[PDB]
């Protein structure tokens, strides 16, 4: 079972994700996403030159946040490091399918599709 999510990212993340077919582990090891996907969810916080990209991941890979967004946890995140110490399985970056560019942020303004 899969869920469509949305994320604002740099082109380098976009390309790596496309090439590997897998979600890229972020600089903190934690990848925040808009669920359900919405360009407007984090469009304000997004940096100029960023791309809004929607993609499909297994629903099971989405970790509960008690907030209006979802997150994907990687092996080197603090959550992953805690999991290993507790003898839990190492979190793994899930597959990402139907990767589609749905927006861009140019000169402080958000454009859809």
Query: Residue numbers of the site for Zn ion (CB under 5 A)?
Result: 40, 67
Strands 51-58 and 2-9: antiparallel
Nearer CB in complex with Zn ion: 19/107: 107
Nearest partner of 33 among 82, 84, 74, 83, judged by Cα: 74
The H-assigned helical ranges of the chain are 11-20, 78-85
Question: Could you tell me the smallest distance in angstroms from the CB atom of residue 15 to Zn ion?
Answer: 19
Comparing every residue's Cβ against Zn ion, the nearest one is 40
Question: Could you tell me the smallest distance in angstroms from the CB atom of residue 34 to Zn ion?
Answer: 12
Question: Could you tell me the smallest distance in angstroms from the CB atom of residue 64 to Zn ion?
Answer: 11
């Amino acid at each position: 079972s899969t869920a469509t999510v949305g994320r604002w990212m740099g082109p380098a993340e976009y390309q790596q994700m496309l090439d590997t077919g897998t979600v890229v582990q972020s600089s903190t090891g934690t990848t925040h996403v808009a669920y359900p996907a919405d360009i407007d969810a984090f469009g304000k916080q997004a940096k100029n030159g960023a791309m809004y990209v929607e993609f499909d991941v297994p629903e099971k890979s989405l970790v509960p946040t008690n907030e209006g967004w979802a997150k994907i946890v990687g092996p080197d995140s603090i959550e992953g490091r805690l999991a290993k110490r507790k003898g839990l399985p190492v979190p793994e970056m899930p597959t990402a399918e139907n990767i589609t560019v749905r927006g861009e942020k140019i000169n402080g303004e958000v454009e859809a599709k």
